Amino acid sequence: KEEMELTLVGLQYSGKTTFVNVIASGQFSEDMIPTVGFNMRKVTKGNVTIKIWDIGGLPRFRSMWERYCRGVNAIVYMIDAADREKIEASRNELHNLLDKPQLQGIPVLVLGNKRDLPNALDEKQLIEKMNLSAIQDREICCYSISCKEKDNIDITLQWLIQHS
Amino acid sequence: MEPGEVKDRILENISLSVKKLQSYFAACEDEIPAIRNHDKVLQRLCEHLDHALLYGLQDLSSGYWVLVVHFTRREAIKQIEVLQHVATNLGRSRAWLYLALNENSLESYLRLFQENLGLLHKYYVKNALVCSHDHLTLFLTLVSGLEFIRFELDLDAPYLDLAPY
Numbered sequence: 650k651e652e653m654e655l656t657l658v659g660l661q662y663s664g665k666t667t668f669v670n671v672i673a674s675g676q677f678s679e680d681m682i683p684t685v686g687f688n689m690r691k692v693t694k695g696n697v698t699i700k701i702w703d704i705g706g707l708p709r710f711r712s713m714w715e716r717y718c719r720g721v722n723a724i725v726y727m728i729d730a731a732d733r734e735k736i737e738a739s740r741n742e743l744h745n746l747l748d749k750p751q752l753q754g755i756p757v758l759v760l761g762n763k764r765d766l767p768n769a770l771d772e773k774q775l776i777e778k779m780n781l782s783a784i785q786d787r788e789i790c791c792y793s794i795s796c797k798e799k800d801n802i803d804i805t806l807q808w809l810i811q812h813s
Numbered sequence: 814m815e816p817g818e819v820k821d822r823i824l825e826n827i828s829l830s831v832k833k834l835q836s837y838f839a840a841c842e843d844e845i846p847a848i849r850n851h852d853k854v855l856q857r858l859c860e861h862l863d864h865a866l867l868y869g870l871q872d873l874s875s876g877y878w879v880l881v882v883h884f885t886r887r888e889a890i891k892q893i894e895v896l897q898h899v900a901t902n903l904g905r906s907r908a909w910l911y912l913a914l915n916e917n918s919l920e921s922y923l924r925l926f927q928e929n930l931g932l933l934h935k936y937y938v939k940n941a942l943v944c945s946h947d948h949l950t951l952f953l954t955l956v957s958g959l960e961f962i963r964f965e966l967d968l969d970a971p972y973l974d975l976a977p978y
């Protein structure tokens with residue numbers, strides 16, 4: 650099989666580990682354990698084996714994000730689209746990560762997860778509120794997804810495979 | 814003397830070593846406290862961590878390196894492979910341990926052990942400490958005590974290649 654590496658970052662509770670579970674086994678769970686440090690999983694989709702570094706998003710682990718993003722094929726930045734109170738912190742952590750010189754040029758996929766919830770932001774609002782327009786020195790894309798209801802999981806995978 | 818008692822002893826020795834290192838680190842009056850290779854508390858800790866990870870290896874001379882490369886990011890593997898004064902896979906196992914402590918990552922690695930029993934059984938005998946569910950869960954609890962301790966260990970230590978005999 651072909652191989653690629655991706656790193657999944659984003660604030661706690663945004664659905665990073667849930668996303669890995671959904672694309673690995675199709676299984677959504679309402680109750681989850683916060684990731685203490687990092688997880689790693691291999692998932693095969695078609696003929697690409699993807700090695701996923703799933704980093705904890707709790708505050709004390711964000712200092713680790715750059716370490717695990719260096720050299721990978723793409724970074725997936727996960728956002729709880731329904732958690733308005735967290736968007737400001739999510740915006741700041743994303744722009745802080747992308748300011749790191751050793752991550753120059755790596756493509757970024759911003760995922761607005763939990764679109765099934767009633768107050769979830771849509772792709773257009775997420776782009777504005779995360780100031781994605783201000784990123785002009787790398788490829789960046791934004792999709793609104795639901796791990797629970799499965800919206801846009803397939804196009805997310807398609808994007809990741811195009812960056813193998 | 815029973816293998817269960819032996820494994821229990823190793824874990825008790827890890828427990829005591831973590832506690833002594835915690836107390837040493839908390840009492841340090843340096844402006845930037847950091848555990849280093851020459852600290853006796855570090856040497857005792859790593860001696861006992863190394864025991865737990867070498868116990869029950871199918872191929873002792875290759876060390877736990879051949880397992881943990883499955884769980885380690887590429888740049889860290891490369892960094893260990895190019896160390897000038899670490900020449901063997903056993904030494905690389907120990908340098909990986911020092912790096913894991915530097916990165917406060919031992920818990921994440923031990924969780925990957927629990928999630929990969931197939932890999933564990935390829936490298937360890939059934940009797941091994943990491944192959945016992947009860948013992949591996951306790952090991953993980955013990956090392957969670959190193960999460961907020963600053964380690965500044967030199968990975969390129971030549972004594973790391975010394976094999977048991």
Ligand SMILES: Nc1nc2c(ncn2[C@@H]2O[C@H](COP(=O)(O)OP(=O)(O)OP(=O)(O)O)[C@@H](O)[C@H]2O)c(=O)[nH]1
Pocket residue numbers: 659660661662663664665666667668678679680681682683684685704705706707727762763764765766794795796797798
């Ligand atoms: N309603 C809804 N809930 C979701 C969705 N995706 C994930 N969740 C829930 O969000 C919660 C957080 O899940 P995790 O996957 O552990 O979050 P994480 O980003 O890995 O968190 P850390 O490991 O702390 O960084 C879980 O309760 C999931 O059930 C979704 O699409 N819709």
Ligand SMILES: [Mg+2]
Pocket residue numbers: 665666667682683684703704705
């Ligand atoms: Mg998680």
